[PDB]
Design a protein around this motif. Sequence first.
Motif, PDB file in Angstrom:
ATOM      1  N   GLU A  37      39.703  19.613  56.141  1.00  0.00           N
ATOM      2  CA  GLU A  37      41.030  19.319  55.652  1.00  0.00           C
ATOM      3  C   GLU A  37      41.931  20.495  56.003  1.00  0.00           C
ATOM      4  OE1 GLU A  37      40.511  16.402  53.582  1.00  0.00           O
ATOM      5  OE2 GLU A  37      42.542  16.025  54.339  1.00  0.00           O
ATOM      6  N   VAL A  38      43.161  20.195  56.385  1.00  0.00           N
ATOM      7  CA  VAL A  38      44.112  21.239  56.703  1.00  0.00           C
ATOM      8  C   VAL A  38      44.949  21.371  55.452  1.00  0.00           C
ATOM      9  CG1 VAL A  38      46.218  21.841  57.967  1.00  0.00           C
ATOM     10  CG2 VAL A  38      44.253  20.933  59.184  1.00  0.00           C
TER      11      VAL A  38
ATOM     12  N   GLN B 116      40.949  16.466  62.719  1.00  0.00           N
ATOM     13  CA  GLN B 116      40.154  15.285  62.379  1.00  0.00           C
ATOM     14  C   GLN B 116      39.527  14.730  63.651  1.00  0.00           C
ATOM     15  OE1 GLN B 116      39.329  15.247  59.654  1.00  0.00           O
ATOM     16  NE2 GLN B 116      41.018  16.246  58.574  1.00  0.00           N
TER      17      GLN B 116
ATOM     18  N   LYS C 111      46.742  18.973  62.244  1.00  0.00           N
ATOM     19  CA  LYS C 111      46.060  18.105  61.285  1.00  0.00           C
ATOM     20  C   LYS C 111      45.239  17.067  62.047  1.00  0.00           C
ATOM     21  CE  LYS C 111      48.163  15.798  57.589  1.00  0.00           C
ATOM     22  NZ  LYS C 111      48.326  15.863  56.092  1.00  0.00           N
TER      23      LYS C 111
ATOM     24  N   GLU D 133      33.051  17.994  57.239  1.00  0.00           N
ATOM     25  CA  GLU D 133      34.236  17.319  56.724  1.00  0.00           C
ATOM     26  C   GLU D 133      35.258  18.442  56.704  1.00  0.00           C
ATOM     27  OE1 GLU D 133      33.992  15.276  52.903  1.00  0.00           O
ATOM     28  OE2 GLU D 133      32.481  13.925  53.681  1.00  0.00           O
TER      29      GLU D 133
END
Lengths: 135, 135
Positions: A31-32, A105, A101, A29
């Motif tokens: 996140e930026v 993902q 971003k 998982e």
Amino acid sequence: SPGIWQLDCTHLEGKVILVAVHVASGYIEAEVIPAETGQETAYFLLKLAGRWPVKTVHTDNGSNFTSTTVKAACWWAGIKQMNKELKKIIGQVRDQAEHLKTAVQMAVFIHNHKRKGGIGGYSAGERIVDIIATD
Amino acid sequence: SPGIWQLDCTHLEGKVILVAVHVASGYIEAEVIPAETGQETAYFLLKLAGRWPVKTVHTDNGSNFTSTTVKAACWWAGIKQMNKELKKIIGQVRDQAEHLKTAVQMAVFIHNHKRKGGIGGYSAGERIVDIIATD
């Protein structure tokens, strides 16, 4: 062990990428985030914990976890104490995505769905659900 | 059906909360965003899709999904087309958390871990992993 996660930050294009890896399965998982802050880390852990049964977390940079903010999130959630690959995949899809971003993902999606190959072939994503389910 | 999700935005303290519900299990994932934008929705869906096998998504506000940005994320991920409760739980933990962001993830954690009660008692979180695993 199904409750072990690894969490680290990596850098790209002057941005910070928070990466969590479920050790037993290889599931990630990400996140930026703007900057490598303790508030960002605590928040990320809170999200992770409400979704998977997170028992312990490891990191390659122990100072990552010293803030009271991070310690508060771990206490509340009851938590105790791929970069090259992910970065490669990210490199591969980078033009397809307008922002880092979005490339990140996309990379996470690609990595989690990649089957180990062969008759049957399970992906990290299939592996994590099975390991947690069975457990 | 294990591939169906519901996605909507709700408002609190002038902020926007993106809420996704896995229909068959009641499992939710949430994010606090600045504004109700198509770019925020596409991003959220990309993240959701790289983690669960998302086949279709429903919403109570169809105009939510008309942007080309959202349509692009659904096309790429291969996607086809609790608020009172969550809001209550959020109300209950609001003082314990400094920011709404943090109260929301605490609420998600509480809701997903709540067992249906009785001998055995499974939570939405246990239910989603079993449904996906079995499938």
